[PDB]
From Swiss-Prot, chain A:
It comes from Escherichia coli (strain K12). Induction: Post-transcriptionally regulated by the GlmY/GlmZ sRNA regulatory cascade. The sRNA GlmZ, together with Hfq, directly activates glmS mRNA translation through base-pairing. A second sRNA, GlmY, positively regulates glmS indirectly, by sequestering the adapter protein RapZ and protecting GlmZ from RNA cleavage. The keyword Protein biosynthesis does not apply. This is Glutamine--fructose-6-phosphate aminotransferase [isomerizing]. Keywords: Aminotransferase, Cytoplasm, Glutamine amidotransferase, Repeat, Transferase. Homodimer. In pull-down experiments interacts with CedA. It is found in: Cytoplasm. Catalyzes the first step in hexosamine metabolism, converting fructose-6P into glucosamine-6P using glutamine as a nitrogen source. Residues 1-217 form the Glutamine amidotransferase type-2 domain. It comes from the Bacteria.
Amino acid sequence: CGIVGAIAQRDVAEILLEGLRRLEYRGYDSAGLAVVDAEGHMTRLRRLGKVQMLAQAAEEHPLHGGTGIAHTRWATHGEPSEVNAHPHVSEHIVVVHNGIIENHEPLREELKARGYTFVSETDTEVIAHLVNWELKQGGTLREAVLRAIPQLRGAYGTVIMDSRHPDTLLAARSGSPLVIGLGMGENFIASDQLALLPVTRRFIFLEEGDIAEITRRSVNIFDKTGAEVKRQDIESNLQ
Amino acid sequence: CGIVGAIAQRDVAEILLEGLRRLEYRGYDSAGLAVVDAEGHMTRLRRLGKVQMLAQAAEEHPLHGGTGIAHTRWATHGEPSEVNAHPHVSEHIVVVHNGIIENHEPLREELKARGYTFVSETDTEVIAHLVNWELKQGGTLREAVLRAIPQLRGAYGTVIMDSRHPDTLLAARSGSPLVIGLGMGENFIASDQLALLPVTRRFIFLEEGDIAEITRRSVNIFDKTGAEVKRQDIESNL
Ligand SMILES: N[C@@H](CCC(=O)O)C(=O)O
Ligand SMILES: N[C@@H](CCC(=O)O)C(=O)O
Ligand code: NA
Ligand code: NA
């Protein structure tokens, strides 16, 4: 239900937690985050419960790394539990997701035949294993995500990262909002601009069907056929 | 003329240079910056001429480090030259300064007598040598600055760092404006809030006579008797 992501030189865990504090929708049930450092070391922490519980856990095990994604969940598929909380993983592929993957069943079956173990009951987890699958077929994360997204049906927003290549985040808007926040030598993404105001006031709103490749220094947006599209940045005057 | 400073986890050179670009409208003859990394390695680059010239040189000497100060100068003491541009140094003490130190002559002679060599013709350089002097007497950078400031007369603002302890910046407002910009796990300072808008919208204005010690995580403000004062932070989108 709430997504925040960041790709920066500085540690982003505190920015992600502050973003989640700004995305605490009535009835959400769990929260989690994953950060990866420059050497590809990933730390993921999830909790059934409130962002404050996650924040307290993060205080104990300080999470270093300039690339990360975080999520508050409002469960639709799978009961609230830490196992089902986001980020979900498929080895090096880490995903957070808002909305629903309608065709999760057939997809889950295909991936199971490809040798993938599902550990959660969520529709989300199919996104992770599928991008893992596509990436195995060769190409960059952007290319794999371009192949993946058409296979997914439903109303969703997702941000994906590959812990082996922590210099890029991929994001796709396909029935649920996402907005990019532009920083200086760092970039952010959230499902609501309100999450990002502490660190930037300049935004690019993704449009329906947009897939964005975000690095510390560049934002490149494409549609599903892989065509590059131009989206305007705007300065927000909200406090 | 324009001052920008930053103390962050990320490299700050780009933020400093952008801050200077935002200050060019005030006019200036030279500009410079200094950044220090976590290990105390200081890189200083100065140019007679435009910020764009400095930014170009920075592109060849990519400056790494999370603590730094930068300045555009409008010369009052000493002709425009790279030697007279700030930041000025005294070994590990590095200073940028707006305004004038009216009593620079007596202090310069005093510090010359004390063994310092002045490389520049600026009043500014006395600040660097004086803080270096006071620090030799013992204490923290904050303590040394508290002892230095009362010796200076003039209408000025200054930001000071010690490359040996890159986790703190000291700033003193004594007749020329300075504003702190509050970030998340980083803090900034400038002579004009316009310099800081790209990175934050929350500010604390230093009041006359305030001496601030700024770290990545905290801002502690004192008066000249060393008393802690509380200043209000305000949000200001321009
Ligand atoms: N359907 C996903 C995401 C729900 C949401 O948008 O929070 C889940 O149940 O985990
Ligand atoms: N008096 C100092 C500072 C001038 C300024 O405020 O730019 C100098 O001449 O370098
Ligand atoms: Na869709
Ligand atoms: Na004064």
